Amino acid sequence: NKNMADIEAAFEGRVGVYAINTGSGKAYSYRANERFPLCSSFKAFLAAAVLKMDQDSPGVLLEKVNYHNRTMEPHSPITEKFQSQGMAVGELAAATLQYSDNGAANLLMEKYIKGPEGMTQFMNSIGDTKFRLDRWELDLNSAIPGDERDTSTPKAVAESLNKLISNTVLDNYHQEIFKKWMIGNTTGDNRIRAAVPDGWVVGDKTGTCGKYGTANDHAFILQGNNAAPLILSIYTTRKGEHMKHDDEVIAKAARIAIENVK
Template identity: 35%
Template structure:
């Protein structure tokens, strides 16, 4: 019922949120896609940020693309890239004790009796399972949030910032710029990490493989992509009572061989978590249809 309702609203409604035109206008206008995304946002009761980035054309479409949103666990994708790039870290032994194991740390809990994991294992499970303890161990080894933010700047991201560790970074307080990004910045960063020369070809392949292996976002953006489109993603969920956020960064390839990153952030929707997931899936469905019709 919720999905049908969202679809009907999306086709009928055109809101007033800021949209970015494609860098190279496709054959089909972005107006219908903009109306669909406006409608999904209105039906969700929250604020929806979205950016589509193409390997060939750069930024193709954005809705609230320059507005700040809490990152939640989406930062772990770039943290894994930093780990892969930093010499020697993947082979290092990262020790931890019971006090380091956070409430959501499935892999760390498996390793509790052993009391350590390698840097590569930490990066792998920070992405695929979103393990919070693994992420904190990597942050500690790599110099903390400040060093991570400096690495982002060096990678060309002038917007994204990490200020705290897990779980404090998930607060999502109104107007707080800490631990935030924008849809446009995140989509471009991920595209550059996967398709640029910042990482070696081997490390790009490892990172992409982890995103494909991830199963936490099957009901979000990947749930709206057509069968046969190879996809991976990194989710993020955070915020306290009354200020939840549901995020997803999907990377996908069409049957024609075109590569895209779709970054989506849904802040403070009024429905259930399942309904929030459905909004993100419907957004991906609308974007995929636009890609197919436009030849973008």
């Protein structure tokens, strides 16, 4: 528990961590360039791609999407609620990020982003050449060791998140929406957020494949007093198909990474 190698050994699996202090440049890396399953964590970038489409076509966020005749994907807490009358594109983006909504992700990749291929192209176009999304929900969650489908690296995820808040892709209006969505994420209280002092503000997106004990979290962290953000990216997976994940391992890794870049 005092260092990342000991956390990983006791977890019995693979832990990948990249953190950077965007003010000082201090970074921390542990298997930062190895591949891990994305699970739900791509959904933050999907929401950002929808924001960019609206940036490039003002009004997209208010277009309405109807899906009355759909069999809703498991883990669709918002889209199942609104099925009777549809949802605005911007609320689908908010739902897929803040609630990890699976229906919202597939709907947006069916009608706006051009499938998993289009998701990958968006990431590629901002300079992320590690990210690949290959399949739809929920098959993208298989998390098979050695399978590079639907994977990225901890460092690539961190760097892409930084790009999305550092004026390289989204204008300041759309960046602010993206950052408010991340800060309002509902699913991360037991991961990176569990490692930060009260008073710091965290915007994060989690992922939990349900296979191979695979779970992750990436975030920007605002210490306050106008400090530049910390970026943290933490991915884990294990060898056995039905092994369970462990939130506390991610939180322990977060404490180490924060200590080394703060």
